[PDB]
């Protein structure tokens, strides 16, 4: 009795809610280039804070996805449009000795170029995956997407790379960071910590596996949704990073055509010809697969585990896809996913790989991009961190897992699992035995 109402401000109590998060860019770079300012995020471990997490449900993954789209749109906006290049192609492609690999070879056509009364013959090379065959004589070809979308050449001076990004909440909202070392994507976290901003997440763009990300604290971690076994994607996150290396040993020649926007095409190739390929530490790879199999048969009690390469679908999912700088790759990944199971740099694997220029935009089709050729020979090196698997149902008595993960949002889904955002509720009340004085 006599417990008079009292009020308290600055209260530590919060709730879940969506909000618009700040991005943050590096101090050096090539909206994004100079801003927002590079932070110095701190972090406290909180004593007894118990919070639940859900890496499938949280909103900010969608915001990452939208921001990536918007930034790509802004970067691509001032670049040239390749619409006048849509003319009929009359090409036979038998000049160089190693003809069959590319089969677009000085590939001829007409362009309007300097004077609009004039029309001039030109030619350049193309990889046949960027080409479709018209009816009648095979010499008649067309650009692949030109009957369905408008193609923009990438701005060569604005080459973009997986620059790390830190995400910062606004005032009144705090980002909760689970420090648990064996978090499965759902359930309580007893090791809650808070920060101004997230660490520097990179916008990696790849399929069937991811190339640049973080690593797990424990052993290889399995994360999947648990509403039903009939899942879309299963995320496997490596603790032991494994190196992968790739090469494009042939030397390219850049050539230019002006519309006065400078269109770039592929000139004559220099040096003897090889098919672009990759390399993998052979023992390390299927040591890691053995670890992943041992982890994976924990969930599934008493059934075999086996891998096969993906079947059907576009080139973006039938092959591992990634990019060394300003070139794009599609590596025929049959050998890597052919083990089977039941209830340290020797013997290096190599795998064949193809490259193509005209890329349907990753998140969604209907808008087309053209990457100008990169001169000379190219290699890039990365160290993978996880796999994107999907389970083939139906087959009784035998599980089967195959490389999928073509949907671009899953890459950032597998990396933003750390965090959650909460609205602060600074105002609260309580009973107490003291009242105002008149």
């Amino acid at each position, epitope marked *: 009795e006599n417990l008079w109402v009292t009020v308290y401000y600055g209260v530590p109590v919060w709730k879940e809610a969506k909000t618009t998060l700040f991005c943050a860019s590096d101090a050096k770079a090539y909206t994004h280039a100079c801003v927002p300012t590079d932070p110095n995020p701190q972090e406290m471990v909180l004593k007894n804070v118990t919070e639940n997490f859900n890496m*499938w*449900k949280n909103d900010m993954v969608d915001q990452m996805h939208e921001d990536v789209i918007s930034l790509w749109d802004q970067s691509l906006k001032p670049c040239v449009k390749l619409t006048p290049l849509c003319v009929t192609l009359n090409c036979t492609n038998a000049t160089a000795s190693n003809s069959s690999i590319i089969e677009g070879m000085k590939c001829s056509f007409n362009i309007t170029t300097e004077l609009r009364d004039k029309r001039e013959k030109k030619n350049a090379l193309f990889y046949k995956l960027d080409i479709v065959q018209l009816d009648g004589n095979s010499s008649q070809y067309r650009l692949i997407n030109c009957n369905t979308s408008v193609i923009t050449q990438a701005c060569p001076k604005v080459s973009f790379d997986p620059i790390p990004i830190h995400y910062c909440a606004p005032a009144g909202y705090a980002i909760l960071k689970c420090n648990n070392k064996t978090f499965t994507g759902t359930g309580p976290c007893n090791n809650v910590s808070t920060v101004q901003c997230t660490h520097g997440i990179k916008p990696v763009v790849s399929t069937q596996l991811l190339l640049n990300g973080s690593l797990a604290e424990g052993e290889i971690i399995i994360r999947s949704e648990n509403i039903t076994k009939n899942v879309k994607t299963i995320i496997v996150h490596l603790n032991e990073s494994v190196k992968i290396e790739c090469t494009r040993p042939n030397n390219k020649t850049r050539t230019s055509i002006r519309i006065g926007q400078w269109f770039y095409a592929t000139g004559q190739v220099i040096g003897d010809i090889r098919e672009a390929y990759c390399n993998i530490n052979e023992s390390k790879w299927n040591e890691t697969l053995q670890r992943v199999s041992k982890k994976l048969k924990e969930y599934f009690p008493h059934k075999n585990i086996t891998f096969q390469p993906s079947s059907g679908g576009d080139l973006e*999912i039938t092959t591992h896809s990634f990019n060394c700088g300003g070139e794009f790759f599609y590596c025929n990944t049959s050998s890597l996913f052919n083990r089977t199971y039941m209830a340290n740099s020797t013997r290096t694997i190599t795998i064949h790989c193809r490259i193509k220029q005209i890329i349907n935009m990753w998140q969604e089709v209907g808008r087309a991009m053209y990457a100008p050729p990169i001169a000379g020979n190219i290699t890039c090196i990365s160290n993978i961190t996880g796999l994107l698997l999907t389970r083939d149902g139906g087959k*009784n008595n035998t599980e089967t897992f195959r490389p999928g993960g*073509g949907n671009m949002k899953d890459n950032w889904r597998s990396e933003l699992y750390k965090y959650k955002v909460v609205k602060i509720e600074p105002l609260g009340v309580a009973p107490t035995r003291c009242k105002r004085r008149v």
Partner: antibody
Amino acid sequence: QVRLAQYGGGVKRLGATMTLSCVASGYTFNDYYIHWVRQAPGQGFELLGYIDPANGRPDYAGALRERLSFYRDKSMETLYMDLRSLRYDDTAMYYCVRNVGTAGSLLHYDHWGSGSPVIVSS
Amino acid sequence: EIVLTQSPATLSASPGERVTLTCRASRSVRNNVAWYQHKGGQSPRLLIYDASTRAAGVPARFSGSASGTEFTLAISNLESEDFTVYFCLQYNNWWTFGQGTRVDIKR
């Protein structure tokens, strides 16, 4: 509002290969998995497989993985199914059905297609 | 691997009654069950998509509930139009379909 029309079918001769199709009315082509389910006469339904329209990934029932094939043409918002070497028992009606998918799981079917009867006989 | 035995084969009733349909799971399927209406040779239609939650646009007379591994669809007022076929469905695992049950006029 959403419609899933179908074409193809009719009679097909024994041992032949046949092609169905479904045209997705405008809801959003890339957001919903599509499943191909059928019904033999005097029997309950069963599933053949599902195709993700976005990336074109198929997946089949274990008893028909040699004979089936799915693929799409995203520009036309159109789907196709190829079944090879029709046998007698495959005389049945074949349906398209939209699937309601969450961010990480597939749940159930909401809108069925208009149907496509097929009869195997020479 | 998961088989839905839907029982009984046929249910006789008169208009306006409460009528019950049952779906038996071979083993556990959580709440991952649904129900559909099947017209006289047309597109099937959705009635109840979780174990109890009615689908949008369905009349309120349709209802169902979880019973552990058994699942039950109940229609409060079996109208003239509802004398047709209904089938249950599970989605905890690979997809499967029940045999379906007819509802017909009593005499």
